[PDB]
Amino acid sequence: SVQTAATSWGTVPSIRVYTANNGKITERCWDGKGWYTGAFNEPGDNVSVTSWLVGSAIHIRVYASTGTTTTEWCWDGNGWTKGAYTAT
Amino acid sequence: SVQTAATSWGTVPSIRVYTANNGKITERCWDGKGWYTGAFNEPGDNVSVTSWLVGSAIHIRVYASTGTTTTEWCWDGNGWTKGAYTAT
Amino acid sequence: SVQTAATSWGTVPSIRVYTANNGKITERCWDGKGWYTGAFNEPGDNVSVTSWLVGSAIHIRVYASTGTTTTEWCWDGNGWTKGAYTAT
């Protein structure tokens, strides 16, 4: 089936749910006023996520895997880019 | 194999582990005095979870997927019910 | 594909990413100064993780599944050992 990963922050809360579906990962977002589609859209058959909230900043790391290759995607307030994570 | 998702809260801690096994998701609970089977029992081949603790209340969201359909299940102090989450 | 699970703590942060790959789970670690391979290495086709930081101590629980058997692995400051978790 499709595979999901979820994270949340604050007291509203904000929630992000990532779904790997047919080789593509997309993102659904809740910030207290309805679900919507987020900016994250990257290839992958499997996804995990962690996040940490510091002051006014959310930091999100999404680990997207295809075959044996895992790419880390980073949100630090200014869009998604690949992070330095490698498998070894 | 079976697929799991885990969350925890507080300092005891309380832990919840969800297992998707043969199309069914069940829940195991730890609150500091042994593991036991929780109330959550719903269909699904894949599961993710997030939770947030506010004051005296734990809020849990479990994302259960079968095929391309994902159902959000909500714990907000009074049993599990379906939440408003949709895939798009 | 390979399957991952991730957790993080503090403000640096520390991040741990577990990868189930070809029946083996390994661990990659970030503590603010580069990624490295952690001590965790155990069998499994699926992995989930949760952690909680209390005072100066991180507690990590990794749920490793092969077939219908799930083993809980515990980090409480002194290496990884099997925990009391059972499926029922």
Ligand SMILES: OC[C@@]1(O)OC[C@@H](O)[C@@H](O)[C@@H]1O
């Ligand atoms: O619009 C909300 C948003 O900016 O929140 C932070 C990230 O989850 C982004 O992908 C997302 O688009």
Ligand SMILES: OC[C@@]1(O)OC[C@@H](O)[C@@H](O)[C@@H]1O
């Ligand atoms: O600021 C981005 C970054 O340094 O954040 C910490 C880790 O996620 C790294 O892999 C990543 O490159």
Ligand SMILES: OC[C@@]1(O)OC[C@@H](O)[C@@H](O)[C@@H]1O
């Ligand atoms: O008995 C403990 C319990 O009420 O804790 C909150 C939820 O995890 C429930 O499914 C569970 O049954």
Ligand SMILES: OC[C@@]1(O)OC[C@@H](O)[C@@H](O)[C@@H]1O
């Ligand atoms: O109180 C339930 C609810 O509003 O909580 C926030 C989100 O999980 C929603 O999808 C859900 O319907």
Ligand SMILES: OC[C@@]1(O)OC[C@@H](O)[C@@H](O)[C@@H]1O
């Ligand atoms: O070296 C860092 C380390 O000790 O951090 C705690 C655990 O994640 C361990 O597996 C890991 O080796």
Ligand SMILES: OC[C@@]1(O)OC[C@@H](O)[C@@H](O)[C@@H]1O
């Ligand atoms: O100290 C280890 C332990 O008691 O921690 C809480 C739970 O993870 C238990 O299954 C585990 O045996």
Ligand code: NA
């Ligand atoms: Na992944």
Ligand code: NA
């Ligand atoms: Na799911």
Ligand code: NA
């Ligand atoms: Na598992």
